[PDB]
Design an enzyme around this catalytic site. Structure first.
Site, PDB file in Angstrom:
ATOM      1  CD  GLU B 115     -56.430 -11.344  29.451  1.00  0.00           C
ATOM      2  OE1 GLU B 115     -57.073 -12.174  30.098  1.00  0.00           O
ATOM      3  OE2 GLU B 115     -56.191 -11.501  28.222  1.00  0.00           O
ATOM      4  CD  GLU B 135     -53.712 -16.065  32.300  1.00  0.00           C
ATOM      5  OE1 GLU B 135     -53.452 -16.010  33.507  1.00  0.00           O
ATOM      6  OE2 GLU B 135     -54.648 -15.407  31.780  1.00  0.00           O
TER       7      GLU B 135
END
Lengths: 251, 258
Positions: B115, B135
């Site tokens: 990210e 995740e």
């Protein structure tokens, strides 16, 4: 949740399906039972029905969320619960036929969200509008944040939510809460007249105005314009439209 | 209330007009945490005038393995909203930085680390760099801007697959799917990233403005709108003194040659 049919009065008056919210002791508060039963009447609507009038039994359209049945919800449960309300309102907004809500007395919270999902609102003088959940730290979960700004603009909604501001029917018609105001007389009667009027429409009229129009209006203009020529050409070229064109033209 | 920077988690230098920012938690593969993120935001606030590019890079074998799994803090719904927003404000200083940001990628670029990399304008990947969003394994979605920035690089379809299955991509695969604009097969992403920073350093400020800020907006606008906006960005850029100076020098050198 089991649909609770007792909380509605369903009738057919010629080609108009009428659905009265029937919990007048709780001011037609929406609970899961009511909403599941309402979702049911709006499923597989019989073909002879060409309009729907939703109305309230008693002085009030709907005071919104049933405060007795006030439940306890974690983040996940509340997402699912709001989503279930959305699926019921989808049956209104995307009804095969126009849905007209006759509004009077309280139109509050989820009551207002419910009136928002209908196509046309007719308000009697006694109607009033509020989003009182804000005072209890609760955002809207019934589509209001998407539907009501399209009728009244963000800024008037934001004020309602922040200050508990209430609007009357008379203020409401100017601001966009309803297309109609009946200053003296009955919202139900007028909705029924309207029901009978929209019942004369060609089905493709309904499609184009109920489905295509809101999407055309919201598109990039070049996109909406081409989508318009396409909807129009299809409508115009339909048999019903030719029959209506010829009858009128023949004299 | 704001989290206090931990500047010891970063190694910051200035090489010519390039601010270099090295993620420095090597014992945990540069796992991101609140103080590193706060220190990061700081380095990108009020970036001095002499700086004309930023290279973000990892000390050690890895770029960043993302969120520090030893430093999980228990958080209610509201808190996790506030905490996600916090991280978004850090990455906005990358995305909307006044100069271009280049990320030098190697080893792990996963989760929050991906990210972070996504917020950068250009990524250079060494052969060892590898990409993942683990995740979903843990029952959780991204909270660091990834669902916004990454599909613009690699499309939703590839992102959705990465999240549902834990799929990993190498640096070689990634340059093809859109993870990086560059691959360095031999030698060092840092070295490459630094030569790119020296190159962007030569650009006029209004070129950085138009490219970093206006271009993304124009490209996602409806076409008629992006187009008028382009004409407007174009005329401003072209009518600026730095642009005229460069056009003077370009046409004076060909008339020197003749």
């Amino acid at each position: 949740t089991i649909a609770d049919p007792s909380t509605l009065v369903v009738d057919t008056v010629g080609p108009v399906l009428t659905i009265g919210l029937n919990r007048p002791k709780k001011r037609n508060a929406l609970n899961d039972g009511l909403m599941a039963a309402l979702k049911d009447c709006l499923t597989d609507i019989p073909d002879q029905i060409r309009a729907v009038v939703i109305h309230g039994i008693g002085d009030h359209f709907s005071a919104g969320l049933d405060l007795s049945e006030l439940r306890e919800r974690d983040a996940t449960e509340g997402l699912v619960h709001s989503q279930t309300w959305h699926r019921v309102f989808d049956k209104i907004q995307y009804c095969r036929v126009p849905v007209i809500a006759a509004l009077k007395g309280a139109v509050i919270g989820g009551g207002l969200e419910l009136a928002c999902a209908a196509h046309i609102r007719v308000a009697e003088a006694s109607a009033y509008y509020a989003l009182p959940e804000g005072s209890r730290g609760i955002f809207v979960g019934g589509g209001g944040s998407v539907r009501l700004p399209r009728l009244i603009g963000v800024a008037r909604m934001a004020d309602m939510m922040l200050t508990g501001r209430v609007y009357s029917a008379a203020e409401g018609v100017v601001h966009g809460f309803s297309q109609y105001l009946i200053e003296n007389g009955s919202a139900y009667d007028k909705a029924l007249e309207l029901g009978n009027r929209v019942a004369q429409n060609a089905p493709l009229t309904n499609f184009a105005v109920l489905q295509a129009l809101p999407m055309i209006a919201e598109a990039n203009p070049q996109t909406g314009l081409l989508m318009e020529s396409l909807m129009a050409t299809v409508a115009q070229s339909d048999q019903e439209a030719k029959t209506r064109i010829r009858a009128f033209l023949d004299h």
